[PDB]
Design an enzyme around this catalytic site. Structure first.
Site, short mmCIF file in Angstrom:
data_model
loop_
_atom_site.label_atom_id
_atom_site.label_comp_id
_atom_site.label_asym_id
_atom_site.label_seq_id
_atom_site.Cartn_x
_atom_site.Cartn_y
_atom_site.Cartn_z
N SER A 114 2.87 15.02 5.64
CA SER A 114 1.61 14.60 5.06
C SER A 114 1.55 13.08 4.86
CB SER A 114 1.36 15.32 3.73
OG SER A 114 2.48 15.16 2.87
N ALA A 115 2.70 12.44 4.66
CA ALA A 115 2.70 10.98 4.55
C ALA A 115 2.29 10.30 5.86
CB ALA A 115 4.08 10.49 4.11
N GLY A 172 10.11 4.84 5.96
CA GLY A 172 11.54 4.71 6.14
C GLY A 172 11.87 3.50 6.98
N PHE A 173 10.85 2.96 7.66
CA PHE A 173 11.04 1.91 8.66
C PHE A 173 10.26 0.64 8.36
CE2 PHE A 173 11.13 6.04 11.11
CZ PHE A 173 12.51 6.14 11.12
N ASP A 214 8.27 13.55 13.56
CA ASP A 214 8.22 13.24 12.13
C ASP A 214 6.87 13.63 11.52
OD1 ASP A 214 9.29 12.42 9.72
OD2 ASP A 214 9.10 10.28 10.16
N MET A 271 0.81 -1.20 0.00
CA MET A 271 0.00 0.00 0.00
C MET A 271 0.85 1.26 0.00
SD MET A 271 -3.45 -0.44 2.08
CE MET A 271 -2.98 -0.96 3.73
N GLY A 272 2.08 1.13 0.47
CA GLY A 272 3.00 2.23 0.60
C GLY A 272 4.18 1.75 1.43
N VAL A 310 4.15 -1.28 4.29
CA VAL A 310 2.79 -1.36 4.80
C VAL A 310 1.97 -2.20 3.83
CG1 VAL A 310 0.77 -0.08 5.55
CG2 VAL A 310 3.07 0.89 5.91
C1 VEU Z 1 -0.49 5.24 2.98
C2 VEU Z 1 -0.30 3.75 2.88
C3 VEU Z 1 1.02 3.31 3.47
O1 VEU Z 1 -1.36 3.12 3.64
C4 VEU Z 1 -2.58 3.06 3.06
N1 VEU Z 1 -2.70 3.38 1.81
C5 VEU Z 1 -3.92 3.31 1.24
N2 VEU Z 1 -4.28 3.60 -0.01
C6 VEU Z 1 -5.62 3.37 -0.11
C7 VEU Z 1 -6.32 3.61 -1.40
C8 VEU Z 1 -7.72 2.99 -1.53
O2 VEU Z 1 -8.07 3.45 -2.83
C9 VEU Z 1 -6.94 4.21 -3.19
C10 VEU Z 1 -7.06 4.78 -4.57
C11 VEU Z 1 -5.72 3.34 -2.80
C12 VEU Z 1 -6.58 5.05 -1.94
C13 VEU Z 1 -6.11 2.95 1.08
N3 VEU Z 1 -5.05 2.91 1.96
C14 VEU Z 1 -4.93 2.56 3.29
C15 VEU Z 1 -3.67 2.63 3.86
C16 VEU Z 1 -3.59 2.27 5.31
O3 VEU Z 1 -4.57 1.83 5.90
N4 VEU Z 1 -2.42 2.56 5.92
C17 VEU Z 1 -2.16 2.70 7.30
C18 VEU Z 1 -3.09 2.46 8.32
C19 VEU Z 1 -2.72 2.64 9.65
C20 VEU Z 1 -1.48 3.03 9.96
N5 VEU Z 1 -0.55 3.27 8.98
C21 VEU Z 1 0.79 3.70 9.34
C22 VEU Z 1 1.42 3.10 10.56
C23 VEU Z 1 1.92 2.73 9.20
C24 VEU Z 1 -0.88 3.12 7.64
O4 VEU Z 1 -0.02 3.34 6.77
#
Ligand code: VEU
Length: 286
Positions: free
Chosen positions: A146-147, A33-34, A143, A29-30, A37
């Protein structure tokens, strides 16, 4: 009150930690640095699983995240559901955020519609409310960016990533953070909640302009320099307002800019504290 998962369990619900991006068929999903996800599913709940990636420093951050998350519950902070310490790889399990990160929504990544000015105001207020909670409870985030502001289904802002958080001056030798967001004193190794305020000011500029904090192929490269361009009379805040908006009025935009400018004082003790930032943003929409 957190649940203790086993590494194999989180593996099987993430398609065995399928590192390919979600948009391509994987579960990534992304990444920060650590760690990476991953999207996952446990029972009937969609979840986010961060698989953490010196190794001694990583474990301390993992333990700090749990410690902070155990003591810090608030509607504008992300919620930890559990973790996995089984084996060598460490995992943290969070409530899924259907609208992802503020960074990705400001850039309209994957085709999402631009955020309205009304939604942008509520997001700025919510993120300030979350920082206010952390500072009232004597945590410095260190930290803010916006991310690290995630968005739920109603676009409620939720601050994330407490691995580097510290109790609340104090200098350190390990300088951490994202340079394009950091206060000058934070870049010098000072630890102070005043630096959280400065980083929030950069976030407010991102909200106003829709521009990334840093862009290699843009002049200026660093967003925070636009305050200087505006201040030296060369430009106006209206010249930089995100054009992917048709519900922004100049009065409230200028009100938000005034807050960001105050947050972006180079000198730390001229910055407002978070409670004042909170009040100013509340006065914006009244
Ligand atoms: C930002 C990333 C890393 O995470 C995400 N991305 C997401 N994108 C989409 C969509 C759906 O349709 C789109 C077009 C793709 C937008 C959904 N979406 C949910 C997350 C997500 O729940 N991430 C986290 C939840 C709790 C905590 N943390 C931090 C502690 C690490 C998170 O990164």
């Amino acid at each position: 009150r957190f649940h203790s998962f086993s590494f194999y369990e989180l593996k099987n619900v993430t398609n065995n930690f399928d590192e390919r991006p979600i948009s391509v068929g994987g579960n990534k999903m992304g990444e920060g640095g650590f760690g990476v996800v991953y999207k996952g599913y446990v029972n009937n709940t969609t979840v986010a699983v961060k698989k953490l990636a010196t190794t001694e420093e990583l474990k301390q951050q993992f333990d700090q995240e749990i410690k902070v998350m155990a003591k810090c519950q608030h509607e504008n902070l992300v919620e930890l559901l559990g973790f996995s310490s089984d084996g060598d790889d460490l995992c943290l399990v969070y409530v899924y955020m259907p609208n992802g990160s503020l960074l990705d929504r400001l850039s309209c990544l994957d085709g999402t519609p631009p955020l309205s000015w009304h939604m942008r105001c509520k997001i700025a207020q919510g993120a300030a409310n979350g920082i206010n909670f952390l500072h009232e409870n004597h945590h410095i985030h260190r930290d803010i960016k916006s991310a690290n502001i995630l968005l739920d289904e109603a676009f409620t802002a939720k601050i994330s990533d407490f691995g580097l958080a510290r109790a609340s001056t104090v200098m350190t030798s390990r300088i951490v953070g994202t340079t394009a967001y950091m206060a000058p004193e934070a870049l010098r190794g000072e630890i102070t909640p005043k630096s959280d305020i400065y980083s929030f000011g950069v976030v407010l500029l991102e909200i106003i302009t829709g521009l990334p904090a840093v862009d290699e192929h843009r002049e200026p490269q660093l967003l925070l320099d636009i305050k200087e361009e505006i201040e030296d009379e060369e430009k106006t805040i209206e010249d930089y307002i995100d054009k992917k908006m048709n519900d922004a009025d100049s009065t409230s935009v200028e009100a938000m800019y005034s807050v960001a400018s105050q947050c972006l004082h180079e000198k730390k003790n001229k910055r407002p504290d978070i409670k004042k930032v909170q009040q100013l943003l509340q006065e914006m929409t009244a």
